[PDB]
Paper text:
HIV entry into a host cell requires a critical membrane fusion process mediated by HIV envelope glycoprotein (Env) transmembrane subunit gp41, a direct target of HIV fusion inhibitors that are usually adopted to treat the AIDS patients without response to other antiretroviral therapeutics. Most of HIV fusion inhibitors against gp41 are peptides derived from the helical C-terminal heptad repeat (CHR) of gp41, including a number of currently experimental drugs and T20 (Enfuvirtide, Fuzeon), the first and only gp41-targeting anti-HIV agent approved by the U.S. FDA. Finally, by introducing an innovative C-terminal tail of Ile-Asp-Leu (IDL), we succeeded to increase the anti-HIV potency of a CHR-derived peptide (Trp628~Gln653, named CP) by more than 100-fold. Unexpectedly, the crystal structures of CP-IDL in complex with NHR helices at different lengths (N36: Ser546~Leu581, and N43: Val539~Leu581) show that IDL tail is capable to bear two different conformations: a part of an α-helix (with N36) or a hook-like structure (with N43).
Unexpectedly, well-defined electron density shows that the whole CP-IDL folds into a continuous α-helix, which can be perfectly superimposed to the C34 peptide in 6-HB structure, despite the significant difference between their tail sequences (the counterpart of Ile-Asp-Leu in C34 is Glu-Lys-Asn). By forming almost one turn of the helix, the isoleucine and aspartic acid residues of IDL are located at the outer side and hence have no interactions with N36, while the leucine residue participates in hydrophobic interactions with Ile548 and Val549 from two adjacent NHR helices, respectively. The interface area between one CP-IDL and trimeric NHR is 1098~1218 Å2, where IDL tails contribute 66~124 Å2 (approximately 10%). In addition, we noticed that, “below” the N-terminus of N36, there are plenty of space allowing more residues from NHR to interact with IDL tail, of which the structural features cannot be unveiled by the structure of N36-L6-CP-IDL. IDL was designed to target N-terminal hydrophobic pocket (NTHP), which is mainly composed of Leu544, Leu545, Ile548 and Val549. As for N36-L6-CP-IDL, even one of the six helical IDL tails is missing in the final model.
Numbering used by the authors:
A (entry chain C): 544 to 581, 622, 626 to 656
B (entry chain A): 544 to 581, 626 to 656
C (entry chain B): 543 to 581, 622, 626 to 656
Amino acid sequence: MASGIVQQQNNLLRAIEAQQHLLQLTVWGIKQLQARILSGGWEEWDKKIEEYTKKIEELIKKSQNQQIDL
Amino acid sequence: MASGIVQQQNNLLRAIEAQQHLLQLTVWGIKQLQARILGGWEEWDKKIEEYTKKIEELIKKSQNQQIDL
Amino acid sequence: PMASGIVQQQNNLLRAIEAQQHLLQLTVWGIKQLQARILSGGWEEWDKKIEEYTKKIEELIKKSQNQQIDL
């Protein structure tokens, strides 16, 4: 039971990690399309993207560190 | 250590919350680019809202139960 | 801290991840639709990598489902 729960936590984190890598790709796609515009809130959007990207990366790192905190 | 397992459940949830914020930022980005146009987009709005409502419900459920732990 | 409580919540986290995955696939649809308007380069490789990780997380989701049943 205890090992199964831990194993499930490990599985969930990996799904989250894979979700994030999948998020990184979607962000690239939007920024690539936005770069075509030569002629509106993107500068604030850019900062929020950087904001939550870092926050997620820390939470993933924190989750990884928790695996050895027993 | 069952003090870490509760903590790890909290960590995953927070990561999920933050990834939901990032997802919503991507939705805004798509809608911005889409607004520069002029099928699908009306239905796309409906399904974006639908699953956003579904995620927000599951997060609330997970948050409350995180406290019961 | 009942073990059934953690297991219960792990089910929700999994359901949340599954729902967020469906939301993400809806965003991929939106991007590809806008990208299709380009007639002028990363996008062929972008498709390959969206494809690669979509399958990868789906494996992890399926693996999480079968673990959830073993709990």
